[PDB]
């Protein structure tokens, strides 16, 4: 990490549960600047006692523009089927005036009341055929009873959410001092508070923003692909929108059986005849109805932490080349220490702090820095102070040393410098007077 | 544009480790000018040469054109 901020350990309350290794519990607030993408930021922990300390690494990966699912709804593929039982009068004995009340769930006419494979389809009588043609010999007309199903034989289901906004956000990986690594996606353009373990990260700087029309995302459960649309959504299905049936259980999203999902008045196309009714529909598929595209200061708040708690040598080996490049040069150090520990800043490095961690062997862990000239002095790394010094010529963005062609053009530029003034001085006397 | 330039992708390959090596020869624009040199008046003197010699070449061209 290049940008590094230490904690504010002035909150001190540590219980000496064990004498060999201490224990402490603390909280607070912190303000660390946003790191460049592709790099991780640190956070140093300090204790009044010397030997032990820990760290916390916050890694960013990406910058992008997503929006948060304010709602969520499922959409099945509706189909319109309709039956017709055709009694005739005095044989169904149905009332001369059709009963204006209709029981929309049972239908005692055809097998009492059971599960209906429709979602609240309607009911009704009709006009009446009567006479020798329909054959049941009564003069007065006959009522007919009809159903409508909204059905889904082999659905393809879409879940949708109307954020109707766009704010920058990023990708974060986190490193608990214990050693845990838990991923999550913070909407750090909005002061959202994601909860995990003990810590919570929140807002950053919206260094650029943009506007966009009323669009939101369409996704498929088999995952055909991902689609975008105007994507209107509310508690109800408004006329002419993408989503008519808005249904709130995936396990019940194959059929239509949960009550949560809500129909449209007179949506299904029932039409009558002289004998029996036929099915039609006016619903629209999600595609090609209204489609406008087709897809081809990070800071944290601290909770009640679970903070936990000799001879050591540095022994550098080499130096790389970067000054004034956005990543810095990488340096390798070969250490050994009898304990598992963490290191700290070199004072004279004059660029950034340190936060290394080691195992009990001889290893190397390499970190990134940039300088005009190597000094590398004054580090209180681990256990005891050590003053090691390096030396190497650093590499910077310069011109080409390979051919020294610019040297030839440098010699040509300085041509006849005194000659021009010499001709100018004689002309100056004439021009001035 | 690093030297090794080796990185990872997480869908199915699961973060492998490539190796690379690059020289730095490209466009030579830079805010800084030239570079630090020992000089010590052994190198500066060699840099400075006769100035009238450059004027001599242009002088001969003027003689031929008029002639």
DSSP per-residue string spanning A127-175? ----STTT-S--SS----EE--EEE-SS---EEE------EEEEEEEE-
Q: Where are the beta strands (DSSP E) in A161-292?
A: 167-174, 183-184, 199-202, 216-220, 226-229, 268-271, 278-281
Whose structure tokens read 């003990």? A198
First to last CA, chain B: 58
Cα–Cα nearest to A216, from A260, A284, A285, A158: A158
**Alpha-carbon distance A180 to A54, whole Å?**
13
Extract long-range pairs of A141-144: CB within 8 Å, 24+ residues apart.
A141/A89, A142/A86, A142/A87, A142/A88, A142/A89, A142/A92, A142/A94, A143/A87, A143/A89, A143/A92, A143/A94, A143/A95, A143/A98, A144/A84, A144/A85, A144/A86, A144/A87, A144/A272, A144/A276, A144/A277
Q: Is A333 exposed, middle or buried (0-12, 13-18, 19+ CB in 10 A)?
A: buried
Evaluate whether A143 touches A87 at the Cβ level (below 8 Å).
yes
Evaluate whether A256 touches A119 at the Cβ level (below 8 Å).
yes
Q: Choose, out of A329, A397, A413, the residue to mutate when testing the contact with B (most B CBs < 10 Å).
A: A397
- The verdict on a CB contact (< 8 Å) between B54 and A327 is no
Whose structure tokens read 């659905």? A155
Whose structure tokens read 């506007």? A211
Interstrand relation of A79-81 and A149-151 (parallel, antiparallel or unpaired): antiparallel
**Alpha-carbon distance A62 to A171, whole Å?**
5
| Cα separations in angstroms, A221 against A73, A156, A157, A250 | 12, 7, 6, 9
Closest residue to B28, CB basis, from A327, A395, A400: A400
Alpha carbon B47 to chain centroid distance?
Answer: 17
Distance from CA of A398 to the nearest CA of B (A): 5
What the block records as the tokens of A108 is 């005692």
Does A409 contact chain B (CB < 8 Å)?
Answer: no
Extract long-range pairs of A258-261: CB within 8 Å, 24+ residues apart.
A261/A74, A261/A119
* Alpha carbons within 13 A on the beta-carbon side of A352: 20
**Alpha-carbon distance A159 to A82, whole Å?**
28
**Alpha-carbon distance A56 to A40, whole Å?**
10
Q: Where are the beta strands (DSSP E) in A216-311?
A: 216-220, 226-229, 268-271, 278-281, 299-302
Chain B residue closest in CA terms to A418: B51
Technique used by the depositors: cryo-EM
- DSSP label at residue A198: T
- The verdict on a CB contact (< 8 Å) between B25 and A400 is yes
Which residues are bridge partners to A173 per DSSP?
A: A59, A183
Write the CB contacts of A193 (distance below 8 Å, at least 6 apart in sequence): A200, A202, A301
Q: Is A88 exposed, middle or buried (0-12, 13-18, 19+ CB in 10 A)?
A: buried
What the block records as the tokens of A187 is 């909407």
CB atoms within 10 A of CB B25: 10
**Alpha-carbon distance B61 to B67, whole Å?**
10
What the block records as the tokens of A315 is 């022994």
Chain A residue closest in CA terms to B34: A399
**Alpha-carbon distance A229 to A216, whole Å?**
6
Evaluate whether A316 touches A334 at the Cβ level (below 8 Å).
yes
What the block records as the tokens of B67 is 């002639």
- The verdict on a CB contact (< 8 Å) between A415 and B54 is yes
**Alpha-carbon distance B8 to B14, whole Å?**
7
- DSSP label at residue A323: S
Evaluate whether A86 touches A275 at the Cβ level (below 8 Å).
yes
Based on C-alpha coordinates, what's the Rg of chain B?
26
- DSSP label at residue B65: H
SS3 call for A74: strand
Q: Which residues in chain A are contacts of B28 at CB distance < 8 A?
A: 398-400, 406
Q: Choose, out of A321, A400, A418, the residue to mutate when testing the contact with B (most B CBs < 10 Å).
A: A400
Cα–Cα nearest to A351, from A333, A335, A336, A329: A329
First to last CA, chain A: 69
Exposure string of A119-149, with b = 16+ CB inside 10 Å and e = fewer, is: bebebebbebbbeeebeeeeeebbbbbbbbb
Write the CB contacts of A2 (distance below 8 Å, at least 6 apart in sequence): A35, A36, A39, A328, A352, A368, A369
What the block records as the tokens of A260 is 């949560």
Cα–Cα nearest to A412, from B43, B38, B4, B53: B53
Cα–Cα nearest to A161, from A74, A62, A87, A40: A74
Q: Is A381 exposed, middle or buried (0-12, 13-18, 19+ CB in 10 A)?
A: buried
Q: To 5 degrees, how large is the angle CA A203–CA A206–CA A208?
A: 160
Cα–Cα nearest to A176, from A323, A298, A299, A43: A43
**Alpha-carbon distance A349 to A373, whole Å?**
10
**Alpha-carbon distance A396 to A291, whole Å?**
51
Evaluate whether A341 touches A49 at the Cβ level (below 8 Å).
no
**Alpha-carbon distance A353 to A99, whole Å?**
85
The backbone torsions φ and ψ at residue A408, rounded to the nearest 5 degrees and listed phi first, read -65, -40
**Alpha-carbon distance B7 to A210, whole Å?**
31
| Cα separations in angstroms, A319 against A28, A284, A328, A376 | 38, 66, 11, 10
Write the CB contacts of A289 (distance below 8 Å, at least 6 apart in sequence): A242
- The verdict on a CB contact (< 8 Å) between B24 and A415 is no
Chain B residue closest in CA terms to A322: B2
What the block records as the tokens of A230 is 């105007």
SS3 call for A247: strand
| Cα separations in angstroms, A222 against A226, A287, A395, A421 | 11, 16, 53, 82
Distance from CA of A321 to the nearest CA of B (A): 10
Distance from CA of B24 to the nearest CA of A (A): 8
Write the CB contacts of A151 (distance below 8 Å, at least 6 apart in sequence): A78, A79, A80, A81, A117, A118, A256
Sign of the CA dihedral with A370 first, then A376, A377, and A378 last? positive
Whose structure tokens read 């990134």? A368
Write the CB contacts of A43 (distance below 8 Å, at least 6 apart in sequence): A4, A5, A6, A7, A30, A32, A55, A56, A57, A58, A300
């Amino acid at each position: 990490c290049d940008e590094m901020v230490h904690a504010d350990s002035k909150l001190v309350s540590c219980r000496q549960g064990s004498g060999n290794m201490k224990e402490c519990v603390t909280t607070g607030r912190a303000l660390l600047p946003a790191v460049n993408p592709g790099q991780e930021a640190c956070l140093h922990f300090t204790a009044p006692g010397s030997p032990d300390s820990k760290c916390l690494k916050i890694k960013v990966k990406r910058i992008n523009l997503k929006c948060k699912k304010s709602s969520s709804y499922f959409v099945p593929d509706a189909r319109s089927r309709c039956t017709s039982v055709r009694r005739c009068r005095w044989a169904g004995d149905c009332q001369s005036g059709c009963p204006p009340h209709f029981t929309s769930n049972s239908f005692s006419d055809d097998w009492a009341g059971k599960m209906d494979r429709a979602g609240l389809g309607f009911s009704g009588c009709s006009d009446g055929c009567g006479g020798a043609a329909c054959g049941c010999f009564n003069a007065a007309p006959s009522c007919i009873f009809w159903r409508k199903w909204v059905e889904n034989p082999h659905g393809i289901i879409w879940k949708v959410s109307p954020c109707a906004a766009w704010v920058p956000s990023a990708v974060i990986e986190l490193t608990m001092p214990s050693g845990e690594v838990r991923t999550f996606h913070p909407m750090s353009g909005i002061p959202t508070q994601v909860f995990k373990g003990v810590s919570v990260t929140y807002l950053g700087s919206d260094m650029e923003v943009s506007g966009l029309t009323d669009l939101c995302e369409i996704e498929e459960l088999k995952s055909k692909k991902l689609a975008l649309a105007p994507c209107n959504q509310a508690g109800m299905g408004v006329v002419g929108k993408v989503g008519e049936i808005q249904c709130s259980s995936e396990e019940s999203a194959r059929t239509i059986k949960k009550d949560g999902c809500i129909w449209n008045a007179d949506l299904v196309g029932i039409e009558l005849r002289v004998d029996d009714a036929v099915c039609y529909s006016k619903i629209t598929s999600v595609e090609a109805v209204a489609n406008y595209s087709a897809i081809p200061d990070i800071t944290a708040i601290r909770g009640s932490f679970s903070v936990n708690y000799a001879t050591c040598t540095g022994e550098v080996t080499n130096v790389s080349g970067c000054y004034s490049c956005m990543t810095g040069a990488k340096v390798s150090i070969k250490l050994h220490s009898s304990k598992n520990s963490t290191a700290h800043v070199r004072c004279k490095g004059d660029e950034t702090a340190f936060s290394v961690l080691e195992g009990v062997h001889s290893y190397t862990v390499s970190l990134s820095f940039d300088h005009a000239v190597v000094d590398e002095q004054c580090q209180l790394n681990c256990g005891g102070h050590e003053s090691q010094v390096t030396l190497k010529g650093n590499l910077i963005f310069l011109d080409v040393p390979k051919f020294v062609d610019g040297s030839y053009m440098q010699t040509y530029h300085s041509t006849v410098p005194t000659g021009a003034n010499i001709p100018s001085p004689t002309d100056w006397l004439n021009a001035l007077f | 544009g690093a030297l090794v330039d080796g990185t990872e992708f997480t869908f199915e390959g699961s973060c492998m480790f490539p190796d690379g090596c690059n020289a730095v020869d490209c466009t030579f624009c830079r805010e800084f000018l030239k570079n630090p040199q020992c000089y010590p008046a052994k190198k500066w003197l060699f840099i400075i040469i006769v100035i009238l010699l450059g004027y001599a070449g242009l002088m001969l061209l003027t003689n031929v054109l008029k002639a």
